[PDB]
Structure formats: structure tokens, C-alpha cells
Amino acid sequence: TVCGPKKSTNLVKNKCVNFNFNGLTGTGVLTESNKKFLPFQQFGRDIADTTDAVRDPQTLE
Amino acid sequence: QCVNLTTRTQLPPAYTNSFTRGVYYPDKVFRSSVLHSTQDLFLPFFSNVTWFHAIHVSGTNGTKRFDNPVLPFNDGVYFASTEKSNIIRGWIFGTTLDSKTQSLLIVNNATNVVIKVCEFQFCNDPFLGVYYHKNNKSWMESEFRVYSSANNCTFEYVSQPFLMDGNFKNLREFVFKNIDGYFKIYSKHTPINLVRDLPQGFSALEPLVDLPIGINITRFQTLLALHRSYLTPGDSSSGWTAGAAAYYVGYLQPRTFLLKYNENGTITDAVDCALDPLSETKCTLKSFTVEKGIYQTSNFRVQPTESIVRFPNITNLATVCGPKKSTNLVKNKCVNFNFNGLTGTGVLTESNKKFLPFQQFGRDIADTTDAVRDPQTLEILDITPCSFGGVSVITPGTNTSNQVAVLYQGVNCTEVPVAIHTPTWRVYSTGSNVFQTRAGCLIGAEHVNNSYECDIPIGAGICASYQTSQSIIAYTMSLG
């Protein structure tokens, strides 16, 4: 959209991978979550030290 | 165009309470069953909010003027409005409200919201005239009277769909902030009934829009729907039941808050870490409920209220001291002193230490100067650290009562902040009857001669307890 929108290749789940979501980098296994984000929220942190949940830009899963 | 109305006559204000309202989601994070501490612009708990009626019927027979004063905008505004006929329409934001400075118009007319950030020539009394037909009562004709001219815009929003134009009052609450050129509008809506002022309750506010403005705002104004005829103002009933619709304004303030997120991530409760001692202990423990005992919350220190400089009585531009003026000397008061370039803070007193003629300072502990000799009037005066200590909060359990007592540890309390006229709760009235103990000054609790197996240990043989109607008492413990 603005500036230069890039691509992401594909998305893989249930597999320990290195992930970079919108600049947030880390390693982990990504899984589908049943938490219900409020419409204006991006990421969550139930533990207060690590963002345990994240919202995918393409599909809001 | 613009049409002049009668003068506002500067009606005296009427005030009301804001019972724990106006807590918005400060961030864009999801949390669940977490008690999280935040610091931002919030409306303080139990604050003055000034409330204006839409149309003031000053005379019992009827007066039909609008109440839309221009009010300051200081780092955000909490604006609530209760109405049943959609009488207020929008807001005007700006600094001077003329053609010299850019202004925001958010008023909606009958069709849409028309967010317009431009150069407007605003007139004195803005409004939107809505006229019911006196015969068919089917078509409600609307005519805006806001701006004479609008020039050379930097933003515009419009809404394609159209919106339609006895105690079913409804409450709309908004919070406006200006941060980093972003105009943040947070919103919330709720049905109400049979409450004329702000009702008792809590309601978190959900962010609605972040508008990329990038201009300054310092004053704002409210636009109303004029039901009557300005050309031919009627005797009575031309308005809406004597200006029933009303709106309340309060100003945010930088504050910390203990915020409670439930399992769904919806804010449900809040606590002011700067409202009264109980709330400070709640924030310190990072929980909403506290058990009986004594908790140390914060530290207390006397601040130096002035400065004094004593430089030698020779010009020479240590004798090459820079150009600065030596002010007079004060004593028996914690001040910031600068003697011959030697800086510090303390209370000065006349000293009996016999200095030898060649000595200047005095030091007992080898890292702190005890006494000093003034360069201009050569008198020996000693220095003391004025005061400091820790503040403990005596409290029984949060089930029992919200009364507490405050103990300043190891300090005289002829100098604790008193007679005061930001949490300025101190005492500002000696109706608590403070009384010293070897452990410090205990404020807010009663003295009693009776002795009991003491429950809350305070110190030096003094313990406090909650007794029956009921309050805190302090007494010397008995052994049985």
C-alpha cells in the first residue's frame, strides 16, 4: 500500500520456525489460537515478558 | 451564512461529580486476567465536571437562548452528553477560531459527519437550525449556520449514508486527545433512565479514530440544534422541553492507574495510585484487595524552598569566583546553600563549636561537612540534613473498612506537611490530632488508654487496632 508493500512468501504453522511479523522477530511454533482480540489490538502478552499472541496481517486469524 | 443570537450573559456555572468515569484502553495490546499498571492522561477519580444545559429557560415563562461557551482544551477533554432528541451535533476545535489559524469542524448535519479541517471564518454563535413543520409535522428542515467561508482544506471525511433526525435518554461519551499530531477520538454509547446527572458507574472507552491532523488545538466549542425561530422567537415550547439535553465537560490530567483486565480482555475496574493511602497500598502490592497489617508505601522528604549564596566581599572578577550575587542568610530552615562554591542542602543553625582562626570546614565522619564558616560575616554555623523517612499505612482488612492511618517513620511532625490551603491529602487540618511516638508521627488514629493484646505492631511498645462507630486506635500493648 503506502511506501513499498512487500510479500511474505508463505505461512507455516505447527512447526518451529523463525518468524518476523511486521518487524517483530523471534523463533517459535505458531499455532491457531481461540483468543478473541478486540478489533483495535495487534499483539497480546499474558505473561508480561513475551508476546504470546500475534495477529496475522493477511488473514486475521 | 451566519445569524446573530442574543448575548450569552456569562451564566454562572453549575458543577457535578464524575464518579470513576473515563478510563479508555491506553494501548493496542490484549491482556487477560492481569492487573496492569499504566501512566497516561486520565480523568481523575471523583473530579469536578462542569455541566451545561442545552437551552436555559431562565424565566419560568420562558427564555430560549443557547449555552455553548468556548472552553479551554488542556491536554485532552472528557466530554459526556446525555440527550433524547439528538440536540448537540458536533464540536469546533482550534486555537483562535478565525481565518488566521486552521480549525477542525466535526459537526454532523442531517446527512453525515463532515469532518473538515480547513480555514473557517467562524461566527460568534454556531448552530444548526432544525424546524418542525407547524402543520404537517412530517418534514424537519435543517439549515447549518456554522461558517461564513471555508478555504483551502488539508483533510475531509464524509459519510455516504443518511441518518434520520418520553424519558428514553441516551448517553454518548467521548475523549479527545492530541498526541504527535494525531487527534485521538475515543467513544462509547450507553442507554440510561431517570438519571439527570452523570450516573454512578464504570465504562471503558474503545478507540474510535486516530485522525492525522498535525495542528495545534487549544480551545473548543459545542454546536447545538436550534429548534426555535430566531426571527420570531416564540413565548414557550419552541425549544425541547426547556433545554433538557445536557453535556458535561472535564479535563484530563497526567496520572497513574492500576487497571484490571478480566478474562476476555475487557477493562472492568480501576484504581487511582494517587487518591488516598489505601489506593497507594493497593498499587504497591499490585492487587485490588489488601489484608490487615502495616505496609510501607513510599518515602517522604522535605524539599528546600529557597537558595542562598555567600560569596566573599572582594571583587576579583577561592578568590577567582565567578560573577554571582551573594544574597542574604537564613537560618532554621531547610535551604540549598552555596558557601564559597561548596554546594549542598540542609538546615543551618548557630554553632557552639570553637573554630580555630585558620580553619574553614568541620567534618566528624570524614565524608560529610558538619559545620561551616561564612565568608562575609565570619560566624560558625552547623549544617543538618533537614528530614526524611518512610511512610507506612496502618490498615485493617479491606472487608472491614476503608479507613486507614498513616505513620511517618522516625520524624518529628511539627514539620510534616500540614495546613495545605496532585495528591495533597496530607492533613491540612489538625482534626486528626496527630501525636508523636518514638517510631515517628502517627496521623489519623485515636489515642486510647485501654490495653489489649496488640494486633498491628507499630513500634516502641505502641500497637494499633480497629475498634467499634468503628475507627483506628493506638495504644501501649499489655502482656496479659
Added chain:
Amino acid sequence: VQLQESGGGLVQPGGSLRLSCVASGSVTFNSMGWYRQAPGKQRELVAQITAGGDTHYADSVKGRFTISEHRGKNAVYLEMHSLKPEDTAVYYCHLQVPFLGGGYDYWGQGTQVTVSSG
């Protein structure tokens, strides 16, 4: 930002498709709208569903488009069928979030769909 909506496949005249509004979470609404617009012409009102059940439809899309709602995943579907070259456009779904009586709908998220034989 708030919500999000994209994706959709190209089709040929006479084909069928079911456009879906990406589930963005629970949001308060009373009328789900579907607009359509192609370059060189204005946005036009296509299909409206009210929370009560009112189904407003343009005269040009009568008998071919079906609008429905699913509250389990909170998505409104538009089944488009009996397609003709006049449907070559981008489709936009607008939300209903009340503001000051109503305003700032959420059509900004769209999907491109072209109906041609090649």
C-alpha cells in the same frame, strides 16, 4: 485499520461466486453493506442487510445476488450469480459502527473481481 477484507477469484460470464467478509472479531453493527465500483464511474449501493432482516437491493442486481449473515463467525456473505460483463469492478463491504448517531463505515477493505470471457 480495525477490520480487514480482501481476496476473491476472477470469473467468466454466467459464473457463480460467494464473497465473504473476513471475520474481524465481534463488532457492533446494524447494517452490513456491499458497494461496487469500477474506474470511470462512482461507487454504487448494491446490497444491504439490516440486523433485523431488511434486505435492500439495487434494481440492477435483483434476482441474482443473495445476502446473508452468519453470527457464529460474524461474517456477511454475498452470493453473486448469473454474471454479466457489467460486474467487472471492485467490491467494498461497509460496516455500521455508530458514531455521533452514525458515521465512519468500514468499506475501505475491498476485493477486485472481473467478469470476462477471457
Added chain:
Amino acid sequence: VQLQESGGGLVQAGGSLRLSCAASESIFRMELMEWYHQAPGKQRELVATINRCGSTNYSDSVKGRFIISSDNAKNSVYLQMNSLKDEDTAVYSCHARTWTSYWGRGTQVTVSS
């Protein structure tokens, strides 16, 4: 809170009087404000009470003659009295409980009969 109360003195039986228990601290965070009285030779007794929400209460011999009011324009609680009699001669006090109880120094009310 310097909750001073003014307006006391000598009255004639069946008259009226106004007291102006006025607080420096905003009455919005008081959470409770009441009136007590002490008669000569008799212990202290409550007159009336008003809490923050709006609940109002009076003792048995209080209703129908004096009611409790408070105007949110100058921070103050109001107790206007009607049809005063001899046994109402007493020293009155107003109490406010924000986070510690605050009392005023009271005022004398004497009724001639």
C-alpha cells in the same frame, strides 16, 4: 478539611435557622457527611446523614422539621431547621469521613421558651 460550621446562637421557639458547614476539600470525595448534637448533661446523638450516592437518613426526632441539603456550587452541606423547641438547645457538629474522620468545633444553639 476546616469543616467549620457557622450560624449558631439564640433563637425563639418555633423559629428557623441555617447552618453552613463548609469544607475546603471538595465534598465529592467525602463519601459521608453527618450532623450530631450534644445536649447539656446528655451524651452525643446523631441528627442526620447524607452519603455520596444520595441516600439520606434522619434520627427519630428529626424528620418533618429539618432536612439535609447540599449545593454543588459552593462546597457545603445544609441543615435548615423549622419549629425549634427547648430540647433542641444543644451544641451541633458536622462530621465528614474521606479516609479519616474529620470533625468541626461545633456551634451552640439555644432556644428561648
